[PDB]
Design a protein around this ligand. Structure first.
Ligand SMILES: [Co+2]
Ligand SMILES: [Co+2]
Ligand SMILES: [Co+2]
Ligand SMILES: [Co+2]
Lengths: 128, 128, 128, 128
């Protein structure tokens, strides 16, 4: 899939991938998140969030503080480049962002903000 | 001390310890479980369940299947030596079991049956 | 691949894949393991081990007790269906086994036995 | 007590707590770290490093490059507020620091820099 990627977050709190690459030719980029499995969103919610590796911790810590009702993300969080909604099993969501929001020579991370999940669910995103 | 132990499961899906030792001089052993944090039982519940290491996976799988209504535990599971109720933040439980139900030379595990949790929340229990 | 799979273990304690499907038509099945990255064996050691889901905890526990010189695997562990050596970055290893060693209706896990890596490095393997 | 906290980092790559709150009335604050278990420092070393959340990634990445020889921390790292030595099992270390190096409103994290360990061995520290 050019300028896009499909990623799954399953019931074992695992994303199917740990590395995403964005082609510099891509003007925009889409990340499609699906959740195979059977567990509902309150027990095994998955969202997908992108930020520099530097801000990942603060976004997680603040996302937790915001709670369920907030999809565990601090609203208008200026550190978040892009993020999907928190989904439960069987659901799907995509988020498209401008590639110009990313510098070559900077480390980014994608990760889930549901409490405790980032330990397991995280990977790197890099321009190419 | 000695014949009882205070355990906490937090909002970051972790127990405060991963090892417990039962002195053979105890007739009974009491485990007190509290849930520091702010998240609800339906989102981040914790119980504390004891079984041989060999039966743990069955207990976790059959528990998952049982749903929130059953405290993520299969009714009358004979594999479970003991267990607390499933608790939410700001809640607590206690459970006592006769030390005679344990044998020296057998590998025992304590853990949480709330979906996905045992991956991180578990520990060893030994008769020493 | 055909009756085989290539899997990598990295410096971020992650396997590139978390679900392995073995086809019944396969007489044998090959698992190729590589460790991209730059960290050595005593620090970011990776082996790939296969056992029923029920046997995983005992294998990991006895494995931690075998020591580094034993690749953190108890020699002659009857629960281990197949395994690799413990490798560091830049190294590679593979193991092939008979598909008749697996049965329909049983749950299998693949995992790393290096101290503290199995909570993050594990996946399922199923005979289809 | 009051201006001190006991932290244990075990053989399962975890800390006993994930949140430290330092009371403003403290002039100095102590972190006593111990290491229950039996694994050695070259395989399951733990330290206790403090810095702002925004800085954690850098301290971890740079520390990971410094090596065992440097206790997995960059010498004279200007982002490190306080830190312990890297310890193996049965060892203990303590670090006391001036509370005026912390400011209200700023998010601090404590973590272990041995490669890979920060996935699970981290927590927050707040001046309250
Ligand atoms: Co999630
Ligand atoms: Co739990
Ligand atoms: Co490993
Ligand atoms: Co450590």
């Amino acid at each position: 899939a050019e300028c896009s990627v499909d990623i799954q977050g399953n019931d074992q709190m695992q994303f199917n991938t740990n590395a995403i690459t964005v082609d510099k030719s891509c003007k925009q980029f889409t990340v499609n998140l699906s959740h195979p499995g059977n567990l509902p969103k309150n027990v095994m919610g998955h969202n997908w969030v992108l930020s520099t590796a530097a801000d990942m911790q603060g976004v997680v810590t603040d996302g937790m503080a915001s709670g369920l009702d907030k999809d565990y993300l601090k609203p208008d969080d200026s550190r978040v480049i892009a993020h999907t909604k928190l989904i439960g099993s069987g659901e799907k969501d995509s988020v498209t962002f401008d590639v110009s929001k990313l510098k070559e020579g900077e480390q980014y991370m994608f990760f889930c903000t549901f409490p405790g999940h980032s330990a397991l669910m995280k990977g790197t995103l890099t321009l190419k």
